[PDB]
Amino acid sequence: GITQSPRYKITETGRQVTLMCHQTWSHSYMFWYRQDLHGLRLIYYSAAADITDKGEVPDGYVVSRSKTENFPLTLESATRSQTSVYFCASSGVPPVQFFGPGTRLTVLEDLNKVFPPEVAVFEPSEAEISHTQKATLVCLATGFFPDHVELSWWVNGKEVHSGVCTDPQPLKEQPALNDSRYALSSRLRVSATFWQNPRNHFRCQVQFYGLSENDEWTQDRAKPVTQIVSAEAWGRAD
Amino acid sequence: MQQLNQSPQSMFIQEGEDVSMNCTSSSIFNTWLWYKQEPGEGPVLLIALYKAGELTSNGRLTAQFGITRKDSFLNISASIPSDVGIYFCAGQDVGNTNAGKSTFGDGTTLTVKPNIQNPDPAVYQLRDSKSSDKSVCLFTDFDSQTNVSQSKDSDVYITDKCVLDMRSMDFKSNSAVAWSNKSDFACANAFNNSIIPEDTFFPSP
């Protein structure tokens, strides 16, 4: 398989970032793409070991292929124009390419705009329970930047995948503003009898990808680090 | 250099119907590929085409690229929810210098809408589990004919139709969320800028 490291990353303008790619098939060809909302654009591609040639958009990037199984992509001086979802690829015999899971990279002019999400769970309405004999819980995560969030539902320790409906794309809170904070919505629908049981524990988890332990904070608020903000709710019988 | 024109950019087809994406080029391509990138995942090869004019089919999928070696299409039959994602066409760069590389199109983002057989459209108000002061509005149980639009109020947030969980489609329903901090915010007039079913249940807290 192909692995990519890291999966989520936040950096600043002028910083040096390296994205890692690995493969276990010993494929000779390897590729590095960026997927800006222009399609898949080739940055660099390596025919074999120590063979590196430029692609369609090589400006601002540097690669190396000292060994076959690795193809690191380096941003020399990160710019806001290099904010993208980066996909690594490899291929044995052309043309079929195998892609990694992708790296979501966000370059910022400053880390004063990164914020963790505020998560809240909203209990179903008795009107819905009386009308449809169902109970929809709504999870709301607001005020986070960037949109490196993963929402999941937790019910009594197991993972709820039935009756779950999460937003496809986050919602810019101030769409006219640049680098505006985001909001994410989600829903979980259970039977009316399942919600009326008070022992059932509902918890909405939002995995936020923020700052690493190797970053610093000169401001006063808690350093927006990679963390998990969760909201809970228990099923009232009335 | 070589360019692959993929159309249409978006496709919102409903569950069970057919899918059709085209892919045209100004130059010839000896090999045409199709990829499917599911949300949050990477692109995976869908079908490889090595013979011109050969109608290949792996059950639900059907693809072909013409004898002119400049066009290609992809057809998905009986749309199921897991077909949501981006679809790229690719062609191996003709020549040896650019060989190994492949030119991709812009891609078509596909969305599959559920078939709600028994619609019961209603707008409910849900209270927060911590501060009973805050609440959200829940428009739900409307069929795919109803389209939810944003709000003209800058301080009102509107959520479009959500993509359901591909793992399990149990309790498959359409839903939209609205909330705001304005004291003039009431769920009865939250979705006022959208066309809503006339027989929409509007209960009270």
Query: Which of residues A108, A139, A170 is at a domain's end?
Result: A108
What sign has the CA pseudo-torsion A29, B7, B111, B136? positive
How far apart CA A5 and CA A100 sit, in angstroms, is 10
A47 and A145 in a common domain: no
Chain A and chain B share a number of CB contacts under 8 A equal to 157
Task: Kindly state whether residue A113 falls inside one of the protein's structural domains.
Answer: no
Cβ neighbours of residue A154 closer than 8 Å, sequence gap 6 or more: A160, A202, A203, A204, A205, A230
Q: Count of CB atoms within 10 A of residue A11's CB?
A: 18
Residue carrying the six token digits 């600043």: A12
Chain B residues lying within 8 Å of A120, measured CB to CB: 128-130, 134
Contact B129 A233 (CB under 8 A): yes
Chain A residues lying within 8 Å of B165, measured CB to CB: 161-166
Distance from CA of B18 to the nearest CA of A (A): 22
Contact A187 B162 (CB under 8 A): yes
Length of chain B: 205
Report helix, strand or coil for A51. Answer: strand
Tokens at residue B30, please?
Answer: 């000896």
Task: Kindly state whether residue B56 falls inside one of the protein's structural domains.
Answer: yes
- CATH code at A95? 2.60.40.10
Task: Kindly state whether residue B165 falls inside one of the protein's structural domains.
Answer: yes
Q: What is the DSSP letter of B191?
A: T
What sign has the CA pseudo-torsion A134, A229, A12, A182? positive
Cβ neighbours of residue B4 closer than 8 Å, sequence gap 6 or more: B23, B24, B25, B89, B90, B91, B103, B104, B105
Could you give the angle at the alpha carbon of A63 between the alpha carbons of A58 and A66, nearest 5°?
150
How far apart CA B71 and CA B28 sit, in angstroms, is 9
Could you give the angle at the alpha carbon of A112 between the alpha carbons of A107 and A113, nearest 5°?
65
Task: Kindly state whether residue A181 falls inside one of the protein's structural domains.
Answer: yes
How does DSSP assign A92-120, residue by residue? SSSS--EE-S-EEEEEES-SSS-B--EEE
A155 and A49 in a common domain: no
Q: Please give the resolution of this entry in Å, rounded to 1 decimal.
A: 2.8
Structural domain harbouring A194: 118-234
Could you give the angle at the alpha carbon of B178 between the alpha carbons of B86 and A138, nearest 5°?
75
Tell me how many domains chain B contains: 2
Task: Note every long-range contact of B65-69, with CB atoms under 8 Å and residues 24 or more positions apart, other chains counting.
Answer: B65/B29, B65/B32, B68/B28, B69/B28, B69/B29, B69/B30
How far apart CA A16 and CA B108 sit, in angstroms, is 33
Of the candidates A118, A205, A227, A206, which has an alpha carbon nearest to the alpha carbon of residue A154? A205
What dihedral angle (degrees, nearest 10) is formed by the CA atoms of A194, B165, B190, A183?
110
Q: Give CA B137 to chain center in angstroms.
A: 24
Of the candidates B11, B68, B82, B76, which has an alpha carbon nearest to the alpha carbon of residue B47? B76
Structural domain harbouring B141: 122-189
B134 and B98 in a common domain: no
Residue carrying the six token digits 């020549």: B95
How far apart CA A33 and CA A23 sit, in angstroms, is 16
Please indicate the experimental technique that yielded this structure: X-ray
Chain B residues lying within 8 Å of A118, measured CB to CB: none
Tell me how many domains chain A contains: 2
A212 and A131 in a common domain: yes
CA B164 to each of CA B80, B170, B174: distance values in angstroms, whole numbers, following the listed order: 12, 10, 8
B133 and B95 in a common domain: no
Task: Kindly state whether residue A193 falls inside one of the protein's structural domains.
Answer: yes
What dihedral angle (degrees, nearest 10) is formed by the CA atoms of A186, A189, A192, A196?
-50
- CATH code at B24? 2.60.40.10
Distance from CA of B79 to the nearest CA of A (A): 19
Query: Which of residues A108, A137, A161 is at a domain's end?
Result: A108
Tokens at residue A189, please?
Answer: 């629908």
CA B114 to each of CA A135, B148, B171: distance values in angstroms, whole numbers, following the listed order: 19, 15, 11
Report helix, strand or coil for B187. Answer: helix
Of the candidates A178, A16, A36, which has an alpha carbon nearest to the alpha carbon of residue A113? A178
Task: Kindly state whether residue B168 falls inside one of the protein's structural domains.
Answer: yes
Contact predicate A188/A160, CB 8 Å:
yes
Residue B71 identity (one-letter amino acid): D
